[PDB]
Amino acid sequence: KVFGRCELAAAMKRHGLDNYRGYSLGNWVCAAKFESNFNTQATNRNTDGSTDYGILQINSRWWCNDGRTPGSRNLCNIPCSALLSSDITASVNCAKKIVSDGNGMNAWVAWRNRCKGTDVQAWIRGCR
């Protein structure tokens, strides 16, 4: 599924992401746009053999099981395929554990380089 901007904001707001660990809703929508272009089905292979999955590009090294990342952890206890669903519940619960782990939203390279320090409220501007 490819989300609309307002559609994604209303779903992330419903699953409790708004001000989660002090990160306003605009930070999350911004990250999604530049990680996945709002597409739940996005996948990108890393050079160390691990893969990034779904709308927030969560990494198989630490967070989910894809059966082809040797000696990796599964700290969200989900198959990677669960992160590609039209329902973003799995992606959101998984992201809550990542942003809680010490480095905050710096875990998302595109958030660090394209959202941090910018007018992030612009991303939910006009949404009900």
Ligand X SMILES: C[C@@H](O)CN1CCN(CC(=O)O)CCN(CC(=O)O)CCN(CC(=O)O)CC1
Quote the least distance from Cβ 33 to ligand X, whole Å: 6
In the shown chain, the binding pattern of residues 26 to 65 toward ligand X, with x for contact by CB under 6 A and - for none, equals: -------x--------------------------------
Instruction: State yes or no: is 35 an active-site residue.
Output: yes
Instruction: State yes or no: is 52 an active-site residue.
Output: yes
d(CA 124, CA 60): 30
Residue 36, interface with Cl ion (CB under 5 A)? no
Residue 24, interface with Cl ion (CB under 5 A)? yes
Comparing CB distances to Cl ion, the nearer of 5 and 86 is 5
d(CA 63, CA 7): 26
**Candidate residues 72, 83, 90, 94; the one interacting with Na ion per rule CB under 5 A:** 72
SS3 55: coil
The identity of residue 34, as a single letter, is: F
d(CA 114, CA 83): 23
> 98 near 63, Cβ under 8 Å?
yes
Binding site for substrate, by residue number, is 101
- Could you tell me the two tokens for 6? 């307002």
Catalytic residues, by residue number, are: 35, 52
Which residues are near Cl ion by CB under 5 A? 24-26, 67, 69, 104, 120-121
